[PDB]
Write an enzyme that holds these catalytic residues in place. Sequence first.
Site, PDB file in Angstrom:
ATOM      1  N   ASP A 181      54.885   7.448  77.913  1.00  0.00           N
ATOM      2  CA  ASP A 181      55.532   7.588  79.238  1.00  0.00           C
ATOM      3  C   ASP A 181      56.694   6.596  79.365  1.00  0.00           C
ATOM      4  O   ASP A 181      56.478   5.474  79.841  1.00  0.00           O
ATOM      5  CB  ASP A 181      54.519   7.377  80.346  1.00  0.00           C
ATOM      6  CG  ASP A 181      55.070   7.684  81.713  1.00  0.00           C
ATOM      7  OD1 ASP A 181      56.314   7.984  81.809  1.00  0.00           O
ATOM      8  OD2 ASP A 181      54.278   7.626  82.646  1.00  0.00           O
ATOM      9  N   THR A 182      57.906   7.026  79.010  1.00  0.00           N
ATOM     10  CA  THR A 182      59.131   6.168  79.125  1.00  0.00           C
ATOM     11  C   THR A 182      59.381   5.778  80.588  1.00  0.00           C
ATOM     12  O   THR A 182      60.097   4.769  80.819  1.00  0.00           O
ATOM     13  CB  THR A 182      60.328   6.833  78.442  1.00  0.00           C
ATOM     14  OG1 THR A 182      60.605   8.055  79.142  1.00  0.00           O
ATOM     15  CG2 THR A 182      60.075   7.115  76.979  1.00  0.00           C
ATOM     16  N   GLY A 183      58.856   6.491  81.582  1.00  0.00           N
ATOM     17  CA  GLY A 183      59.063   6.158  82.999  1.00  0.00           C
ATOM     18  C   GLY A 183      58.136   5.082  83.531  1.00  0.00           C
ATOM     19  O   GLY A 183      58.295   4.694  84.693  1.00  0.00           O
TER      20      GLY A 183
END
Lengths: 99, 99
Positions: free
Chosen positions: B25-27
């Site tokens: 999850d890059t966010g």
Amino acid sequence: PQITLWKRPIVTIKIGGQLREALLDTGADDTVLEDIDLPGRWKPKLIVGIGGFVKVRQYEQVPIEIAGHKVVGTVLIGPTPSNIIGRNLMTQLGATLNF
Amino acid sequence: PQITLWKRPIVTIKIGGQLREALLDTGADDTVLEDIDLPGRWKPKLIVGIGGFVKVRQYEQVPIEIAGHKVVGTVLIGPTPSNIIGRNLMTQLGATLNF
Ligand SMILES: COc1ccc(S(=O)(=O)N(CC(C)C)C[C@@H](O)[C@H](Cc2ccccc2)NC(=O)O[C@H]2CO[C@H]3OC[C@H](OC)[C@H]32)cc1
Ligand SMILES: [Cl-]
Ligand SMILES: [Cl-]
């Protein structure tokens, strides 16, 4: 471009003639923006996240420029603490995760 | 590995002898898991998401295997609709986004 993840992967977007920043978010199925006006019709939708639920407006076939790349896709407008670009639009860029 | 984002970027993790799946999850600044036991001391922390806030337990210097790669980092335990691997641990894999 190639991006490392020491910093939040924030890109510039242009949508409905408005410039904003948004987070490239592999954990988001959908694209969610808070600070934007879109014209025309839209459908209520509920989406969940860590803290529970948020009510959003679904806008279909929205033209959006993401770090220079023009795409058309679904955009959700609603309260989000951060503008997020989801996989619905990142697949149009041919984005990959590498390790 | 290189993965595309047509499907959710889900990897196998091993933590405290327990096998789970989690979203890359890059966010997410931080790693948040729901379905697991960790031993020892921890700190209250509040984390903001889409839908508001969840109260989590912060566990520091947790050994975790992510798609075969051993790392040690901070793990948050709390309500999340999806187990998530955040940038705190993806930077330890040398993960990049490419488009
Ligand atoms: C189906 O469509 C969507 C459904 C859910 C989401 S989401 O925003 O709820 N989320 C889903 C996850 C939780 C399964 C995407 C995440 O990337 C989200 C994206 C995001 C980013 C910032 C704020 C809120 C949400 N990040 C976080 O909630 O991050 C948390 C954990 O780590 C911390 O770093 C950032 C947050 O601290 C500010 C904390 C998006 C689209
Ligand atoms: Cl970076
Ligand atoms: Cl779309």
